[PDB]
Curated annotation (Swiss-Prot):
It comes from the Eukaryota. The chain holds residues 2054 to 2166 of 2168 of the full protein. Regulatory subunit of the ATP-dependent BRF-1 and BRF-5 ISWI chromatin remodeling complexes, which form ordered nucleosome arrays on chromatin and facilitate access to DNA during DNA-templated processes such as DNA replication, transcription, and repair. Both complexes regulate the spacing of nucleosomes along the chromatin and have the ability to slide mononucleosomes to the center of a DNA template. The BRF-1 ISWI chromatin remodeling complex has a lower ATP hydrolysis rate than the BRF-5 ISWI chromatin remodeling complex. It comes from Homo sapiens (Human). Belongs to the WAL family. This is Bromodomain adjacent to zinc finger domain protein 2B. The lineage of its organism: Eukaryota, Metazoa, Chordata, Craniata, Vertebrata. The gene is BAZ2B.
Amino acid sequence: SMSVKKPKRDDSKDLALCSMILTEMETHEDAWPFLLPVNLKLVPGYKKVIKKPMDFSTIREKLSSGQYPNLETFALDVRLVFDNCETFNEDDSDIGRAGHNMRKYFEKKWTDTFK
């Protein structure tokens, strides 16, 4: 509360460490469905169904331009990428499986780096 604070967690490396995680996600072999925004002119249903599209390139641009206020807002966009994927793709599809794999990969890196 006013003039009563928990001890200051060092957040000075968060930007660099989120960039590293994101590099590792970008270079995973199953990243291909997620590298670029879904083409809303060529993919029927995507625009109406997926209210907040997100992809790795868009996260990279937001990161590089100071549009994440803190590491939690970064994790929310990464998770959004996988939540969107599950909303639109069957579990038993190459893209559906890609999404589950990437989410697992991300969540481990996240825990190991920050928890």
